[PDB]
Amino acid sequence: GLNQIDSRAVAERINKYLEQLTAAATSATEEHFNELPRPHAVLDIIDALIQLIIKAQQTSEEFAIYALQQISQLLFRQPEGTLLLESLVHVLETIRKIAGPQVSEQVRQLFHQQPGHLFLSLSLIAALLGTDLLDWKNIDMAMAKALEQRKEGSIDFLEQLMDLVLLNDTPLALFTDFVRSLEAAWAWIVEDPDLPAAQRFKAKVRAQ
């Protein structure tokens, strides 16, 4: 409902807030979004972006939709900063709630449309646990391919992922959500038993 010049200004400010957040979260000593005190630069950027989306919602969905595309696109860049990943997942989940369930589902669908290998970052998975955006079939298929390809330390990534989602007393996934990875990993252990991660994993499997 705004003039193309007025709407563009909001888009550029959404991006400047994400540029600012990237900077602020990186520099900041705090490693987690919870341990952030009041006041804090990271929280002040988050505050302004949310207040921008709340004002912009009154005219149209478009701004919240755009902000979510940008945040998602940033997460897919696979940043490793836990403070940044947590801040980004926080802002995303807020804008999904602000924007209603139509837009909130569109975000789930966008995540579930991405090639599994994009999520093959433990720090990214960790950040996204507690959202509906993780697709265990896609993630499973991705690791399965890496293990088949005998990619350096994939058995280690698999063990690590399992301690992260299964071994967690309140689990977010089932051991069966990872059949294909388990098979791929077992096949590699069958071929070359003389591997270090192979011993730890052989035990984890026989344990369950």
CA 121 to CA 142: how far, in whole Å? 11
Q: Which residue is nearest to Na ion (CB)?
A: 83
Which one, of 22, 63, 65, 64, lies nearest residue 42 by Cα? 22
Binding pattern for the stretch 119-158 against Na ion, x by CB under 5 A and - elsewhere: ----------------------------------------
| Residue of 2, 11, 23, 28 interacting with Na ion (CB under 5 A) | 28
Smallest separation, CB 205 to Na ion (Å): 36
32 or 200, CB closer to Na ion?
A: 32
83 or 198, CB closer to Na ion?
A: 83
Site residues (CB under 5 A) for Na ion, limited to 162-191: none
Which one, of 135, 133, 184, lies nearest residue 155 by Cα? 184
Q: Is 83 in the site for Na ion (CB under 5 A)?
A: yes
Binding window for Na ion (CB under 5 A); candidates: 54-62, 66-74, 80-88, 181-189 = 80-88
Binding window for Na ion (CB under 5 A); candidates: 28-36, 133-141, 176-184, 199-207 = 28-36
Q: Is 46 in the site for Na ion (CB under 5 A)?
A: no
**First vs last C-alpha separation in the chain:** 57
Q: Is 23 in the site for Na ion (CB under 5 A)?
A: no
28 or 52, CB closer to Na ion?
A: 28
Binding window for Na ion (CB under 5 A); candidates: 1-9, 79-87, 140-148, 166-174 = 79-87
CB 74 within 8 A of CB 90: no
83 or 161, CB closer to Na ion?
A: 83
Which residues would be at the binding site for Na ion (CB under 5 A)?
28, 83
